[PDB]
Design an enzyme around this catalytic site. Structure first.
Site, PDB file in Angstrom:
ATOM      1  N   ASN C  99      64.456  51.011  64.231  1.00 12.37           N
ATOM      2  CA  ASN C  99      64.670  49.829  63.397  1.00 12.37           C
ATOM      3  C   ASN C  99      66.062  49.240  63.649  1.00 12.37           C
ATOM      4  O   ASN C  99      66.233  48.013  63.732  1.00 12.37           O
ATOM      5  CB  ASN C  99      64.458  50.119  61.909  1.00 12.37           C
ATOM      6  N   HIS C 145      65.392  -1.116  68.417  1.00  8.41           N
ATOM      7  CA  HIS C 145      63.971  -1.440  68.260  1.00  8.41           C
ATOM      8  C   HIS C 145      63.325  -1.734  69.614  1.00  8.41           C
ATOM      9  O   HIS C 145      62.356  -2.465  69.667  1.00  8.41           O
ATOM     10  CB  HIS C 145      63.710  -2.640  67.338  1.00  8.41           C
ATOM     11  N   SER C 266      52.346   9.047  95.888  1.00  7.85           N
ATOM     12  CA  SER C 266      51.054   8.490  96.242  1.00  7.85           C
ATOM     13  C   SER C 266      51.100   8.033  97.694  1.00  7.85           C
ATOM     14  O   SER C 266      51.978   7.262  98.071  1.00  7.85           O
ATOM     15  CB  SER C 266      50.722   7.332  95.356  1.00  7.85           C
ATOM     16  N   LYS C 272      54.999   3.904  94.120  1.00  7.75           N
ATOM     17  CA  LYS C 272      54.677   4.598  92.865  1.00  7.75           C
ATOM     18  C   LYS C 272      55.440   5.920  92.838  1.00  7.75           C
ATOM     19  O   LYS C 272      54.997   6.879  93.456  1.00  7.75           O
ATOM     20  CB  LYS C 272      53.190   4.980  92.696  1.00  7.75           C
ATOM     21  N   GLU C 279      59.474  13.725  82.394  1.00 10.56           N
ATOM     22  CA  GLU C 279      58.355  13.773  81.467  1.00 10.56           C
ATOM     23  C   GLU C 279      58.180  15.195  80.934  1.00 10.56           C
ATOM     24  O   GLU C 279      57.860  15.446  79.783  1.00 10.56           O
ATOM     25  CB  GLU C 279      57.061  13.361  82.207  1.00 10.56           C
ATOM     26  N   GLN C 311      57.892  42.516  65.274  1.00 12.84           N
ATOM     27  CA  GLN C 311      57.633  42.561  66.710  1.00 12.84           C
ATOM     28  C   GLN C 311      57.385  41.165  67.296  1.00 12.84           C
ATOM     29  O   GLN C 311      57.601  40.943  68.502  1.00 12.84           O
ATOM     30  CB  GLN C 311      56.447  43.486  66.943  1.00 12.84           C
ATOM     31  N   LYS C 314      60.197  38.357  69.209  1.00 11.31           N
ATOM     32  CA  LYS C 314      60.777  38.379  70.547  1.00 11.31           C
ATOM     33  C   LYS C 314      60.231  37.294  71.468  1.00 11.31           C
ATOM     34  O   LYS C 314      60.986  36.545  72.068  1.00 11.31           O
ATOM     35  CB  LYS C 314      60.426  39.698  71.248  1.00 11.31           C
TER      36      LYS C 314
HETATM   37 NA    NA Z   1      62.306  42.833  66.425  1.00 10.74          NA
END
Ligand code: NA
Ligand SMILES: [Cl-]
Ligand SMILES: [Cl-]
Ligand SMILES: [Cl-]
Lengths: 450, 453, 448, 448
Positions: C99, C145, C266, C272, C279, C311, C314
């Site tokens: 722990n 805008h 392309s 293009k 992105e 657990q 992680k």
């Molecule tokens: Na943990």
């Protein structure tokens, strides 16, 4: 400053749950009618309860009802007022019922009604879009992938994209509605009752399909809220994409659309600047609809059975999500009715970037050339055309330098208008294909010429 | 020295999808075979070319299933991995497979097919868990436990009644899976990049070959839509919420404070120095795993928010959350079913705890309403009688009739048949209640519905 | 089998093997302290330290077999250590729990990851500052805008993102300091009666001090939450960079051309150029938000002290970290592989009357009320729209139809170049102001 | 009508009226700077300041009519100002935008709200430390996996929450410092050529300095994000307090009884005491998480610089803030209205063999290896489970049968009281250790 006072303010729900009053009254009338039928209250008790509840409803509709925080919530507000109006018979409404099954019933009824209202609004927006498409049926714009110009498309084909999105939303709303339309009333606190109620009678009276089969489930379940929240969130993402698109189309860079003054803001100093604030806000309001869904997911996560006070927190997000999506739908519909397309600007923009390229490649394939050879040839021809330069302006002599496959008929496959007319696959932007899909939607939405 | 990567190599590391999208291979091959068959039928490739493609794709699938196929990052994604391997195997015909198709419509097709298969597998696992729960309910059909509100004991209920709560939850989940599956089962194939094609393809033939209801009616929608992913993610998340509540409940029941349930050693952890400590780790992890399923949903909602039309590379980020969500929910369902088959109820511990909480109070109030007393008076009387019991240190069933008659004339000797925990449970009678005959009806319904023998 | 299904469900080594270096460091410190306190001999300590070093070398050489049947990183290392050196390895369990060990290991991993992210952020800030310097005189529109509002300098735009990333670095620094407290020695939750020294292990592992509460030490994952949030806000910034650069790469804007090494294309339309890396940056901001939501939801409503649910903390942290590092680094590469199209931009500017506010400032300076200044300039823009000209092409006599305050000096306030030169407020797009801020950043990032 | 429907959808006054004090403070500072700089007359400035003070008094007396037809807080106050003082009010907006004005106002409101939250956190910490002091000797189980693991002191458990809240306070302090930079003077996005001074207004408003980039100033909402996250992590802590106290209030645990003023019940089941306030604390953590997600999603993928979407950042912030303040204050009231059921707790402790680890520590101290010590203790515990006794009731003879290392001093390590007394590591639950940490916190919180 008192502990009782601080706890009272922290736990009161009437400030938001008063909106359930119509459903609470409907549910309490059905309950009272059943109690009388089952001999648990007298017919005179029923008569007094029904009339008194109808009186309260009228008082609330006339804005003459005083909602009180010291009465905690909608249910206790309405029932204490009923006691004030008709006396001890009002106290028999609690027979064979708990707040736990009452609140579940009321909320499901409110959600059912809200879904019905949303579906009408969606149809209205779909109609607005299809009518905009029919009015602007011949306009060609670029179609984009990666926000790069890919192929030419008809404006109605683009608008039908949003119509189809909204149809899947309508389908989710119909499916959600059916699933939620089961009655929790008669579960009581969680375990049911030994009193001789009839849960089929109240379920029928309230328009539910049937009673829920498990009383613990009935008081513990809020899946209907989750599913409605999610369905609003998906709708909202579609409207966020419509918002992104129309904010871009209203830009001077695109230059495709001009909002009316009534759906935009401006500046006296720069009189040409027209800000599409409503659609920016539609885009932005998709966020709080997503947050509303996360709220109630997180709320339900890890909760033990059966009823917990935590569930008080499922109302505000549902109300917010619903009010927001209704607004987003209706404002998008108004915006669609208050935009014009900038036909000369669009036309001047289309020759950039060789949108006819794929049609030329399809020509060569139709003449027997393999796809890769076709693509290689067309790319070389485009390469002869870097600039204003347009494929349909090249001479046949110039094309024949690359392949003998070119013939004079090629020019019927070049330029953006011919390109659109050459798409022929089902669902394509071809003029006849789009005309068929517009026909399907004019039929489905009962659009008329009047 | 250290190898110095090119810009292209650094970008390729960031954009490659094969590390996760290889799991689409079966659906990608099925889609490509359907496409090639259609191409030949429409005269776009020769029957010879089609046969070479089909046999080569079947070889490749066999190679992958044998673990003899080398997935390559330099080939980017599952589609290019398969098709470059096909070109290496058969040569020129492979280069005609991409006629009248884009990666944009191909990927959408492949992913829908994968989600359709995954949903079918999840529904099977849900039914298995419903059976596990119903079987547990049948084995323990006579056991009474408290029912709780606010984590305070409210009424006595039958354990099978509690377990059927989860079965009913899971039924709504199954319903959502069915409805999601039907809405996703439309074919994007033949939308091409976004606008369709002028080449003479047949989209109804490929849709039929791949088990889709019909082709999608809008090419732009076909390449731009990921609603099926969102709806599947949400359906998983709601299933996961139900299992998180099952987890909370069974972690509580396994505590010593409740003392209701003992997990077997095979589904718990412990301490050699504290041999009575039995940690219900599997159900703790089921509860915890509900979180990543919700996170997966938020990922894709956020991903799609605000995107322009039509196809954007952002959509590549839709795969890993769907795969995570699906693998997690399947594990959660299966492990919950194994846990259900490996728990015992502690009958003496449960029974010793029940009699002292006045759980029969509502039953006594019902008695009084049955004898004609208004609700408010019934509660007045019962509250006062429970007050006497608290003073005497007794249960309601220990009060004399004489004592009860001091508050109301309606009490008669029959009242004792309404008091105590066993009698209280017996007196619930409404549809869907914890009454023994009600629960028996519902268990019969479920036994028939799930084909339990 | 049941044990088999549960074993697969509960195993963590498939993801937690990435903690190995921190696990070994933590176990070395633990053993050193045990010897210092007399709980193990110096000989046992030496055997442990050498064995752990050997294992670390095996892992680095890709010669270590991770085993699902040993569950997790800690038991994999310790069982291997037992195989290697025998009984002394078992003494690591003294006065320690999984722990407190796992909490220690994960804090150390996060500390090291944050140190790496800050380096990457500085590299991206430099890439943006370098791109700004290369294009320091380029005028582009500034938007509200998604409408053209004012003329700005490209470097001023890029410095927005550098300033965003500076806030992010500040959150990373603050997060790191707050997580830099040692849980080691909390044991299962209550501490120990064995004579450990938690101050010694804290120092050995670079922590500021031991945590003051053992239950807190085993139950706390705020460092994970804070790190996830910090990653999410950094990802927000990069998502806005991604949106802007995907817009700027469009034909409609036409502001910039990505190199072929940072785009896809392309054969059929060789113009293009798709900006796929940016992105995907935009889209990866979504998973970083979802990873945060995962751990918030995981911790919500959990009782004390340790629960197996943890657990699940992680994978989201590893994902979020890998993702944001990738996003930062690829944004830097993209920044180094873009070319602006000044000719296209410059030709687009005159129709927008972006010098309007500068003309209003001229009138305000001459004592006109701002509202009047706006109305008058708007009328002049109207005249320009009607005549098809720019403000700078109007005669002085035309301006004087609206006010006497206009004089021949007005022409030095008109045109986009004059407009940018006239901005003068601190933090403004004015040429000299931007040069000052670039100088600040060049010095701060040690750009040579 | 259309105009009507848009007006309702876009109005913000229904929620942003709560910014009035900050809006007025900001406007007074702006007007003062304008006059110092010669952009407005001193008389105009004095009229504006007096008029703004007048309006603030009207609002504080509930005599001000907020109007949807004036859209938002800024226009509401300034149109009212114009109605009150005439022409001078119309010079207030010189060299300013709503874009920099709103960013300034929101930062100031956030700074104030954070100050208020830190006070409420300290009050709850004091409530918890006071509860800890009143019950300083009470032993309860400590749990892992919701199984009893070791005996701990109730004050040690409560100090977990105090340490959690200290990290929250730290986050609030760090968030406040990072937000305390002034956007005022960025104007619409690009700054101005009018001779304002941004340092002057930053000083007047208490900001550290002006933000160095005008586009950043109008486009940044990271301070909202960070404040929302910090609220969400505090809410996480309170949700775990809520879970714990709803469990402790159960009859199954039986540890705690809430007072009637902080519970609900049933007249027919009068010992049923529902802990509704803490259930609602637990549940309200959810909306705080949702508010965070809202603004993360709102900011994701937005282009520069100002967009109408940002109007949606206020409601979540206001909700999150109201919610967390309530959660904090109600938790503090609940802490003052609970009693511990000391006989119920004491009677439950013996059967758990919570002293087992203390006995294992004893054997390790006597020179037995970890595993041997556990082997021996597990055997003994098995005997006690059979016989239905406690370890402390075993004879030294029967212990020595298992190992000769046992001596008569073993009894000082057995039973829950001795077990708690024997913890000695820093931060442990040991009596002396906890006394030290209580002393630390009494001093830190100025408890008298
Ligand atoms: Na943990
Ligand atoms: Cl120590
Ligand atoms: Cl001065
Ligand atoms: Cl300045």
């Amino acid at each position: 400053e008192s502990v009782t006072e601080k706890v009272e303010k922290f736990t009161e729900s009437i400030s938001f749950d008063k909106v359930l009053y119509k459903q609470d009254i409907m549910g309490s009338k059905a309950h009272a009618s059943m109690l009388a039928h089952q001999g648990l209250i007298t017919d005179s008790d029923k008569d007094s309860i029904l009339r008194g509840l109808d009186d309260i409803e009228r008082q609330i509709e006339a804005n003459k009802f005083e909602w009180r925080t010291d009465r905690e919530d909608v249910h206790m507000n309405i029932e204490a007022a009923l006691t004030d109006l008709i006396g001890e018979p009002a106290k028999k409404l609690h027979t064979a019922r708990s707040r736990n099954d009452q609140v579940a019933t009321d909320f499901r009824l409110w959600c059912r009604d809200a879904i019905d209202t949303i579906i009408v609004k969606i149809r209205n927006l779909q109609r607005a879009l299809v009518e905009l498409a029919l009015k602007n049926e011949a306009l060609i714009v670029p179609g984009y992938t990666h926000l790069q110009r890919a192929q030419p498309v008809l404006l109605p084909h683009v608008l039908l994209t949003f119509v189809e999105q909204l149809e899947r939303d309508a389908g989710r709303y119909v499916d959600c509605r059916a699933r939620l339309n089961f009655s929790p009333l008669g579960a009581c606190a969680l375990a049911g009752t030994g009193l001789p109620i009839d849960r089929f009678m109240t379920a029928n009276a309230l328009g539910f399909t049937e009673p829920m089969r498990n009383s613990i489930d009935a008081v513990s379940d809020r899946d209907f809220v989750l599913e409605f929240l999610y369905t609003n969130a998906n709708t909202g993402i579609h409207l966020s994409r419509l918002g992104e698109e129309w904010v871009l189309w209203a830009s001077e860079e695109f230059g495709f659309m001009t909002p009316s003054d009534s759906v935009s803001t401006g500046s006296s100093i720069m009189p040409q600047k027209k800000n599409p604030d409503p659609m920016e806000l539609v885009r932005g309001k998709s966020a709080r609809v997503i947050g509303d869904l996360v709220t109630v997911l997180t709320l339900c996560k890890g909760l033990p059975l059966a009823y917990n006070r935590d569930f008080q927190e499922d109302k505000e997000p549902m109300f917010d999500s619903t009010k927001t999506i209704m607004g987003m739908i209706d404002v998008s519909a108004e915006f669609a009715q208050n935009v014009t397309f900038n036909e000369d600007r669009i036309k001047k923009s289309l020759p950039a970037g060789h949108l006819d390229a794929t049609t030329l490649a399809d020509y060569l394939v139709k003449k027997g050339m393999p796809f890769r050879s076709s693509h290689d040839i067309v790319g070389k021809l485009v390469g002869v055309c870097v600039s204003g330069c347009e494929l349909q302006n090249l001479s046949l002599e110039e094309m024949k330098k690359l392949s003998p496959v070119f013939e004079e008929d090629v020019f019927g496959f070049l330029g953006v208008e011919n390109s659109v007319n050459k798409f022929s696959s089902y669902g394509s932007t071809g003029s006849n294909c789009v005309a068929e899909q517009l026909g399907y939607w004019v039929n489905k939405l009962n659009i008329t010429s009047t």
